[PDB]
Design a protein around this ligand. Structure first.
Ligand SMILES: [Cu+2]
Ligand SMILES: [Cu+2]
Ligand SMILES: [Cu+2]
Ligand SMILES: [Cu+2]
Ligand SMILES: [Cu+2]
Ligand SMILES: [Cu+2]
Ligand SMILES: [O-]
Ligand SMILES: [O-]
Lengths: 439, 439
């Protein structure tokens, strides 16, 4: 096979991507060992769906799990009557999602379960896959001539040949695994054939963060979760929180082997200790460094020039309301709150007007990082922790460290009921989610 | 009596204004004729209540009318659980309103009925009176030494010794009367004893406008509906719409007789005509000019200097929502709407948060002027018809000519349910009113 493993791609044909996927326990070979995971399409990750704007997607999901499940089309600005976070597909039953890909859209998106209370174990077990929306921008020489790869960053822990069960501490912290994988492979080797790489990055982990750095190289950010930046942005490293995506150009500078690493990062996960009459919570501290892949540069690399521009960001109408959403924690209870409440599917929390713009101020009053996700309505991050964002682009997840306030500009698009929640999926399952109704 | 008639004043005593008023049909002498009006306290206008900040008001209203009634404390930022627009006092019954006068308050306010569907005939018949909140600012020499008078501008029409009944055309236009009175007197004479006058002005008419101008003199605006300006503003004339108040200084320039007039003004009232196969609506055009009073200046008037400053206007927090309220008409039906709906006491139209500030954009899409009033929450008019307001002061009524948009800054104060409506009271009775709930 290709030294670099990537999920199989399924492309739309004549403007239609019609596909039947099954969610099923699947025996497979994973990181040198045999395990049974929960998969879509018999693979981990699931197949990459590759579409263009205005395509019709017709995806029939067959549920072959012992529990109910559904799909969240993460990041897609489509109707919540399609991307329905309240829908339940019972074991043995099927449901067809049908939608048109929005005309003004490009980037890396993904699909995974969103049945409240069951997301963390289902995602941790292997249920996820990517969706790429191809753009006319991909035809510019500086992108067309780059070597393109998808990197699905997802960790795993195995016990008795199955995904390790959630502990009480896992529900508090979000579960992380010792197998830190790229496209379901353990430290794969990418032997570059071109000097410029275009990497689409997806954090599909329950809770693990990836503080990305390539040895000896900067990265050039060209897209965030939901679309291109206006121009490339040079960065020395790039933090991807759970649920986030990014696309970078890598400009290989000389021959050799370069490690792509997840550098140490402290997201505020907690342990317990007892030092002679305690038994109380203590910080886990920064993650241990991980090597994600080995990048081998070609001979005498001469990278392409960077594109001078990407996509102009839309000029948005002036906002008509400001919202404040405060995140808090009860760590020992593994309970998580938005404005003092836990999720209730029957309760509407915010009511907004389609085609208006809102300012959402999301404040983290907890001690853990929380990555805040909104369905259906991509947003522009204005600032976080009081620091202006250095680029304009569509995002749908924004990470907040302890005490930080994020200011978001949120155009309301499709009408209907949808949700917002922490994308530490254990925290969502444990209540950190609310309901937005757009009319 | 004093050549200049003004309503009797009732003052708070030791910080308490405790008074029993009856609403009653009362035979009286009015403009040289005998008529029975509906009055508070046996007079037209009702007694002027004069209080200071932090006073307690305890007003027991006894209903001696054949129909139910209640009181609206127009312009007072108090709780809508006291100023209750939904309360009904049945015939023969009594109700005690008790409240504390807010500490940061000054100006001319008023009281009148607000029982939906019955306001226009009750107000037209004589049920209203003024309330003055005295200020420590009244002690500055430039105000203390002026000669002060209240001018209640209210018109009336009589038929068979009683207020003339409402016609169908009256419900469409708002009713105006041929007797254009000041303090219930017909063209009284004010023989000034001082060269500077301080006049508190109240438009307590159902629908008549007063385009005020004093012959040969400017007016110096020093207060709007609900408080002082920051400094006096010189004007050549001053339009008072129904429900509005103002306070002006007049600086008498030489000996002589000067008319205070209501100059011609076209508020968009309509008539009907038939010119050989028509029977359709036709503009009434501008009102005929009216003389309101004769002002006699004293000998060798030497007016005081104007105060350099009045009261600094509060710096308000940034707003958290923008509202749009559109006024429309169905003239032939005498139906009037806000955002396409008529009033329903059971329906909440806007929900806001106490202690936040909102921007309200009120747009008149009708052809008549409509004077928009909000209970409980005084506002700052930013602009009307796209023209910046030339002063900062609290208002609670804002006039909109055909097609004009007013932009208001609305701090939400007391919690509870209250209303907003056109102060053309016939239009309110006929549906032009909505419900705001503050929580
Ligand atoms: Cu997601
Ligand atoms: Cu969280
Ligand atoms: Cu979600
Ligand atoms: Cu009023
Ligand atoms: Cu009106
Ligand atoms: Cu009112
Ligand atoms: O999700
Ligand atoms: O009123």
């Amino acid at each position: 096979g290709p030294s670099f493993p990537e999920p199989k791609v399924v492309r739309s044909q004549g403007g239609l991507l019609s596909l039947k996927l099954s969610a099923t326990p699947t025996p497979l070979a994973i990181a040198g060992q045999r395990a049974t995971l929960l998969t879509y399409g018999g693979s981990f990750p699931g197949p990459t769906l590759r579409v263009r704007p205005r395509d019709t997607v017709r995806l029939t999901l067959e549920n072959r799990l012992p529990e109910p499940t559904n799909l969240h089309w993460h990041g897609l600005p489509i109707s919540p009557k399609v991307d329905d976070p309240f829908l339940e597909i019972p074991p043995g039953e099927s449901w067809t999602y049908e939608f048109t890909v929005p005309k003004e859209l490009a980037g890396t998106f993904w699909y995974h379960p969103h049945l409240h209370g069951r997301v963390a174990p289902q995602l941790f077990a292997g249920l996820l896959g990517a969706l790429v929306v191809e753009s006319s921008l991909d035809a510019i020489p500086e992108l067309r001539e780059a070597e393109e790869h998808l990197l699905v960053l997802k960790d795993l822990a195995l016990q008795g040949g199955r995904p390790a069960p959630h502990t009480p501490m896992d529900w508090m912290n979000g579960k992380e695994g010792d197998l830190v994988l790229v496209n379901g492979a353990l430290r794969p080797t990418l032997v570059a054939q071109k000097a410029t790489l275009r990497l689409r990055l997806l954090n599909a982990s329950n809770a693990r963060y990836y503080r990305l750095a390539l040895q000896d190289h900067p990265l050039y950010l060209i897209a965030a979760d939901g679309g291109f930046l206006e121009e490339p942005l040079e960065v020395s490293e790039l933090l991807l929180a759970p649920g986030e995506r990014a696309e970078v150009l890598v400009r290989l500078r000389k021959e050799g082997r370069f490690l792509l690493q997840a550098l140490p990062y402290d997201r505020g996960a907690m342990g317990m200790m007892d030092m002679g009459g305690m038994a109380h919570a203590m910080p886990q501290g920064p993650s241990r460094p991980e090597t994600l892949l080995y990048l081998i540069a070609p001979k005498n690399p001469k990278p392409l020039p960077l594109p001078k521009a990407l996509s102009p960001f839309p000029t948005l109408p002036a906002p008509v309301v400001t919202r404040r959403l405060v995140l808090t924690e009860d760590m020992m209870a593994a309970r998580f709150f938005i404005n003092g409440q836990v999720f209730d599917h029957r309760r509407v929390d915010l009511k907004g007007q389609a085609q208006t713009v809102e300012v959402w101020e999301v404040e983290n009053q907890g001690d853990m990082d929380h990555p805040f996700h909104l369905h259906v309505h991509p947003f522009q991050v204005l600032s976080v922790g009081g620091r202006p964002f250095p680029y304009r682009a569509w995002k749908d997840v924004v990470n907040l460290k302890a005490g930080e306030v994020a200011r978001l500009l949120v155009p309301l698009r499709e009408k209907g009921r949808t949700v917002f929640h922490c994308h530490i999926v254990e925290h969502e399952d444990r209540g950190m989610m609310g309901v937005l109704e757009v009319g």
